[PDB]
Amino acid sequence: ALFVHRDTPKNNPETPFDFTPENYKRIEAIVKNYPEGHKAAAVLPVLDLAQRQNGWLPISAMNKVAEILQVPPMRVYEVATFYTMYNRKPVGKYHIQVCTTTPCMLRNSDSILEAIQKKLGIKVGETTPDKLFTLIEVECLGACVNAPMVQINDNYYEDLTPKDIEEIIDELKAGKIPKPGPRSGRFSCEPAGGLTSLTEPPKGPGFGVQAG
Amino acid sequence: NTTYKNLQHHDYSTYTFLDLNLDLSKFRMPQPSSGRESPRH
Amino acid sequence: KTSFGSLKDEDRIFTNLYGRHDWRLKGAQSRGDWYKTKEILLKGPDWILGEVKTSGLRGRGGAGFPTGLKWSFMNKPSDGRPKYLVVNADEGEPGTCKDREIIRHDPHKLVEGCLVGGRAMGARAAYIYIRGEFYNEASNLQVAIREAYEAGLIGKNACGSGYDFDVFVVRGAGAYICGEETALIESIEGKQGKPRLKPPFPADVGVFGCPTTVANVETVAVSPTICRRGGAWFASFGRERNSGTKLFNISGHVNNPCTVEEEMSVPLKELIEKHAGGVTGGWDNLLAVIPGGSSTPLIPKSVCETVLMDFDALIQAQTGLGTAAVIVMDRSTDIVKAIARLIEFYKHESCGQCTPCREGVDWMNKVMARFVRGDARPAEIDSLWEISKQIEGHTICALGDGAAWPVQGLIRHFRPELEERMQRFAQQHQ
Amino acid sequence: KVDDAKVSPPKRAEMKTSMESLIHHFKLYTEGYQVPPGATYTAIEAPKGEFGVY
Amino acid sequence: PLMGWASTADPLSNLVLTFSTKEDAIAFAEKNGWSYDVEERKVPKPKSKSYGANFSWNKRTRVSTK
Amino acid sequence: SNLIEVFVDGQSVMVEPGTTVLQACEKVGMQIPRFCYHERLSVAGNCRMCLVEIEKAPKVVAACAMPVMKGWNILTNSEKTKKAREGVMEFLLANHPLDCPICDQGGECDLQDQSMMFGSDRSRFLEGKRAVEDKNIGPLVKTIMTRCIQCTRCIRFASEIAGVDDLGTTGRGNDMQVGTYIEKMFMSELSGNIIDICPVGALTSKPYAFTARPWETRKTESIDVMDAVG
Amino acid sequence: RFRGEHALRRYPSGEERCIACKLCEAVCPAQAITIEAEPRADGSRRTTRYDIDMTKCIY
Numbered sequence A: 001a002l003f004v005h006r007d008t009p010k011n012n013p014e015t016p017f018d019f020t021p022e023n024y025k026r027i028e029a030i031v032k033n034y035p036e037g038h039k040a041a042a043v044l045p046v047l048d049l050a051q052r053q054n055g056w057l058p059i060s061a062m063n064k065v066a067e068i069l070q071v072p073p074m075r076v077y078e079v080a081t082f083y084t085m086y087n088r089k090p091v092g093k094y095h096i097q098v099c100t101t102t103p104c105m106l107r108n109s110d111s112i113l114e115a116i117q118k119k120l121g122i123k124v125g126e127t128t129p130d131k132l133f134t135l136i137e138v139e140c141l142g143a144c145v146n147a148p149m150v151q152i153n154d155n156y157y158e159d160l161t162p163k164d165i166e167e168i169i170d171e172l173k174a175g176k177i178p179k180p181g182p183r184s185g186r187f188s189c190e191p192a193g194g195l196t197s198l199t200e201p202p203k204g205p206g207f208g209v210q211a212g
Numbered sequence B: 001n002t003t004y005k006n007l008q009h010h011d012y013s014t015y016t017f018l019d020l021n022l023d024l025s026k027f028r029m030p031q032p033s034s035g036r037e038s039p040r041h
Numbered sequence C: 001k002t003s004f005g006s007l008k009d010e011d012r013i014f015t016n017l018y019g020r021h022d023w024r025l026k027g028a029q030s031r032g033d034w035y036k037t038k039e040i041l042l043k044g045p046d047w048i049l050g051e052v053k054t055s056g057l058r059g060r061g062g063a064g065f066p067t068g069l070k071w072s073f074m075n076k077p078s079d080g081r082p083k084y085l086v087v088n089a090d091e092g093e094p095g096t097c098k099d100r101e102i103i104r105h106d107p108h109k110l111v112e113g114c115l116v117g118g119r120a121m122g123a124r125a126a127y128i129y130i131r132g133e134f135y136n137e138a139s140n141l142q143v144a145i146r147e148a149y150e151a152g153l154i155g156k157n158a159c160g161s162g163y164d165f166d167v168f169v170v171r172g173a174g175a176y177i178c179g180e181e182t183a184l185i186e187s188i189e190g191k192q193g194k195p196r197l198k199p200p201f202p203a204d205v206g207v208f209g210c211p212t213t214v215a216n217v218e219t220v221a222v223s224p225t226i227c228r229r230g231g232a233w234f235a236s237f238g239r240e241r242n243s244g245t246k247l248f249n250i251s252g253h254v255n256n257p258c259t260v261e262e263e264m265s266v267p268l269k270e271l272i273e274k275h276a277g278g279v280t281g282g283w284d285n286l287l288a289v290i291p292g293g294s295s296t297p298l299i300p301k302s303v304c305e306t307v308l309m310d311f312d313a314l315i316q317a318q319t320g321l322g323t324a325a326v327i328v329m330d331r332s333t334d335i336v337k338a339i340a341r342l343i344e345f346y347k348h349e350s351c352g353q354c355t356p357c358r359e360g361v362d363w364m365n366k367v368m369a370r371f372v373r374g375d376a377r378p379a380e381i382d383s384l385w386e387i388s389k390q391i392e393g394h395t396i397c398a399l400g401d402g403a404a405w406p407v408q409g410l411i412r413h414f415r416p417e418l419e420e421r422m423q424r425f426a427q428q429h430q
Numbered sequence D: 001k002v003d004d005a006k007v008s009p010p011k012r013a014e015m016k017t018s019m020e021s022l023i024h025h026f027k028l029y030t031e032g033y034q035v036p037p038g039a040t041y042t043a044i045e046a047p048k049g050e051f052g053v054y
Numbered sequence E: 001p002l003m004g005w006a007s008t009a010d011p012l013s014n015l016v017l018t019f020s021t022k023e024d025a026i027a028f029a030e031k032n033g034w035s036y037d038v039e040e041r042k043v044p045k046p047k048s049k050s051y052g053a054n055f056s057w058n059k060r061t062r063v064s065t066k
Numbered sequence F: 001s002n003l004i005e006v007f008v009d010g011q012s013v014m015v016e017p018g019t020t021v022l023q024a025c026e027k028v029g030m031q032i033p034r035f036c037y038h039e040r041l042s043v044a045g046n047c048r049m050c051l052v053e054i055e056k057a058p059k060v061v062a063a064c065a066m067p068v069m070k071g072w073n074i075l076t077n078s079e080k081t082k083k084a085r086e087g088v089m090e091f092l093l094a095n096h097p098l099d100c101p102i103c104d105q106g107g108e109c110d111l112q113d114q115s116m117m118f119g120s121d122r123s124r125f126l127e128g129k130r131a132v133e134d135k136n137i138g139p140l141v142k143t144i145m146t147r148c149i150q151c152t153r154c155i156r157f158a159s160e161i162a163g164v165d166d167l168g169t170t171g172r173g174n175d176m177q178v179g180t181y182i183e184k185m186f187m188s189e190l191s192g193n194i195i196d197i198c199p200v201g202a203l204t205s206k207p208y209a210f211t212a213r214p215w216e217t218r219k220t221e222s223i224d225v226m227d228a229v230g
Numbered sequence G: 001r002f003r004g005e006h007a008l009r010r011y012p013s014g015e016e017r018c019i020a021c022k023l024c025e026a027v028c029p030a031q032a033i034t035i036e037a038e039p040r041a042d043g044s045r046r047t048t049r050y051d052i053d054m055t056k057c058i059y
């Protein structure tokens, strides 16, 4: 599934590219956070920084990181293609991930999936016939107490429903972001009832302590 | 208490994690080297 | 002795499940962080290990390790190689919602726990690995680190005593195998993310060649409270052998699925109905119940109505106890399709060291898809039992076993639905 | 034939589909199946008499 | 000269005499008559190897890809 | 003093610490079937073939990379030993294409010899077996990426001896490819010495490719020329 | 099942069915099969010298 080079345009290094020296100060901070003698531990956060700079990551960034961090570049390509954060097919801004595995399928995933499908038009895994909207489905993301979830770039959406699908994507295509918390009430992982957890405001060290 | 006492996270930008990592760059324990700077030194 | 677990307040361990007074070190000091901890830290390592082995804390993480024995294996003298405490802040086993809640609400008690762990067994610094999908709560932990460093209460010469200790938080990039024990370690080490062999233990070579240990967020978050709270009273919770307090993550076809805090032992019907909603339409409506999440065989109606929730009880009931993902499923869904989606998860996240998990998860993907469509004769399903007994314990990691167990539970309890499914599709093919 | 593909070569459908049949076919017709060491004799009642093979 | 085959004037080209020792080899060669050249037997020297030696904090064996 | 008692099926032998199960069995005369081990290369537990049973051991371990404690006893003919090897053999021969005629190592395979002497016969898995596109690693080494059993012996050889370090694994799970990511050719020293190391017929010789077959060639001692090492 | 002429087949609307895989030399008991292969001018493995010694064939 395109895991070899494929020297397309906006590729075939050196595609012209350069960082910010403020980001080089970040790189020096992360290498400061690691023990010397095993300097190659900075590959994942530095390469995450390269993704947060340039949306889908190209290859000249990886070649520059391999030049800086004194590693042979094939290890950098291994760590690049090994994960799903690091996408090399060209993507855009709104990176919709629909999470669906065990409770998310079991609580109407395909209603949400066909809602996204007939709202965006294009098929899953693909993108729109312009930029900035890439739709993929993914594995578990940790909203297991909720509906099958909608992840946009470092933001969650929980407890959805098809009318909320329509309203959220109306504001997204219009350029408005709602609160990235849950929906259908329950502002945390809550039982929606009348406080089935603790009721009294707790004390702490007033009751049981030891060796104080 | 009937109000979500988070939502100080609600205003996150892109560079917040790495900017915090740069903001805590000081008073560090030296993270000690062992001879070399890399195994392919 | 107690009546096999029935939790009541004023006697919990850790608070702030959802939306409490604030999120601040002021509120953490109101709840009870940083209370007289210097006398706990500055005392002696064997006393901490004795408090562990007296309270009977069980090693969490979905597996069931012994706590104090491993942390006493961590007692090599400090040579010219430091010692690391790797906090596994991940969530595997879909159904989980385990430590997302902790690291969103109460990070400062994890600071308590990692400091107690580093001073406890002789460590030097803690490296936290959080999953890459956790930007919000990881940055909340970052702001908590900035608070604790503006106060400066941990770091060089923490707690006013001569013992430096630092915590370095590293985010992930997305894999189930990052949530493992040793591919965790070599995701920290900047390699590609793949495990090591088990006969080199973390007691000799862990993080780069430092004798390290891997700790769960449940055990870290309980760990200072074990010492400072009631000793041999944490052993008085639930069953005496496996004693503890734990989350319970009830998702599935219930009214408002969520997570709760309880003790160790509980009847499962009391857990499902009397603490978190209840089964939509009736208790007898559901098709099946799975505890554990993904690493656990299934439980039918007549077993889930009565069996108390304990590790050895579930093991001799042929199941694991994972990270409290105790979910249900109604008869309106295709449970074979649910198992096949789990096998699709196993195919999407597995590495390629071991030949058998790779090849077996490929065979189980294609054959469980065929059982969703009901293709062959039941010689195929006993062949699936053959391969599922072939894989077990022939791996490096536990993902091969975790791919073995749901297929095993399916064969052990849901024979006739598969028989009728394959006969239906045989008569439709003809 | 016998129920052992390491003794007899398989037939055409297994040869054209299954992997283990082709591996057994190929090494059975290059090397032949390995035989444990032994100095045996048998004899049959051929119409000429005691036909012995040693 | 008709097929390009390798016609040889050699009876003694395809022989292979299978022995178990070296002294009996010398004895058979002196017994039947001809001369001979002798190679030794060069067993593999066992070397210490370990996965816990493949990993190290302060030694320069680093696979960096596993 | 560093003389460790292990029993091969009951028979005693003295073994240095750090040396594995396999060097003990090579000391007594046994071999264990193996792929990702090689006696003059690095050690990892990838290929899973070398599984073995110890008396009083409910956990079957890979005998390539085990530190040997004092006083073992090793079963090399037991029940679940052969069961585990036949299972793993049925696993390895599923994603391998029917190419044993057109393979160049047909006389000198390893899957073939171990599938005779240690494998099952009546296979399963009626439909599947994906295939992987190749790319030329150079002009001198013919490359088919399909027959790779992903044993990771070429990779560690490159990483520890060749130093070129352009040969890694991409992808995950089933979909793992071996070799080059950036389609760059491999022309360094000892690039011909990967046809002796690849235990299956994946990375084979380009100029030799289809001119002979191993069971028809008689061998003769010779000395290396155009060097000074021999 | 009678065994005479020792012919060769080719593909249905196609070229030479042989590969030069040499199993027929490996099983030919009088060694009448003489095969020296060459790959052709495109790369797919084929032959040069294919010889059935009919004076030696034992059918």
Ligand SMILES: Cc1cc2nc3c(=O)[nH]c(=O)nc-3n(C[C@H](O)[C@H](O)[C@H](O)COP(=O)(O)O)c2cc1C
Pocket: C058, C059, C060, C061, C062, C063, C064, C065, C066, C067, C088, C089, C090, C091, C092, C093, C179, C180, C181, C214, C215, C216, C217, C219, C323, C397, C398, C399, C402
């Ligand atoms: C396949 C696999 C999955 C795992 N999943 C998790 C997980 O979801 N969460 C976690 O904290 N640890 C997970 N672990 C790691 C172990 O639970 C961890 O090494 C162990 O719990 C640490 O020791 P403890 O008993 O003191 O917690 C997993 C390990 C494996 C091999």
Ligand code: SF4
Pocket: C177, C195, C350, C351, C352, C353, C354, C355, C357, C358, C395, C396, C397, C398, C399, C400
């Ligand atoms: S069992 Fe599979 S996922 Fe686990 S270490 Fe082996 S190859 Fe990787």
Ligand code: SF4
Pocket: F096, F097, F098, F099, F100, F103, F104, F105, F106, F109, F110, F111, F112, F147, F199, F200, F201, F202
């Ligand atoms: S390497 Fe593969 S294709 Fe070649 S002979 Fe062996 S099993 Fe057959």
Ligand code: SF4
Pocket: F147, F148, F149, F150, F151, F152, F153, F154, F155, F178, F197, F198, F199, F200, F202, F203
């Ligand atoms: S190319 Fe050969 S040596 Fe390299 S991993 Fe594949 S089978 Fe092993």
Ligand code: SF4
Pocket: G017, G018, G019, G020, G021, G022, G023, G024, G025, G035
């Ligand atoms: S070499 Fe012989 S056995 Fe092989 S394909 Fe050609 S004719 Fe058939």
Ligand code: SF4
Pocket: G024, G027, G028, G029, G030, G031, G032, G033, G052, G056, G057, G058, G059
């Ligand atoms: S003797 Fe004739 S029939 Fe027999 S194997 Fe040789 S060519 Fe074929």
Ligand code: FES
Pocket: A099, A100, A101, A102, A103, A104, A139, A140, A141, A142, A143, A144, A148, A149, C094, C095, C096
């Ligand atoms: S499965 Fe969707 S969040 Fe865990």
Ligand code: FES
Pocket: F034, F035, F036, F037, F044, F045, F046, F047, F048, F049, F050, F062, F063, F064, F065
């Ligand atoms: S040789 Fe031990 S696993 Fe490959």
